[PDB]
């Protein structure tokens, strides 16, 4: 009816990292859910630290 925008996105605020941390917080992250392509990146510990 009146295009009063509801999303006021700033540039200082960072959303991607925020969603990453939220996803870590509320549930296990080691599991994989293919729908959202949800698979946290990680390195083999025997490779980072020999």
């Amino acid at each position: 009816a009146s295009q009063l925008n509801a999303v006021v996105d700033l540039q200082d605020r960072n959303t991607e990292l925020s969603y990453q941390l939220l996803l870590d917080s509320i549930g296990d992250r080691t599991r994989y859910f293919s729908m959202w392509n949800q698979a946290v990146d990680s390195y083999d510990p025997d490779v980072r630290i020999i």
Binding site: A1, S2, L4, A6, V8, L10, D12, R13, N14
Partner: protein
Amino acid sequence: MTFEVDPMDEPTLLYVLFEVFDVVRVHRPHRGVIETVYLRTPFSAGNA
């Protein structure tokens, strides 16, 4: 603030996240009408 880090031979950037309060209140007093009130307390719109 005065950080200091070990030398690195490539440009790099310190990233500081200034912990703040970032909330939004959403209202909807009729059909198909959205009114919002954003607010960031430590650094509102007049940020540095």
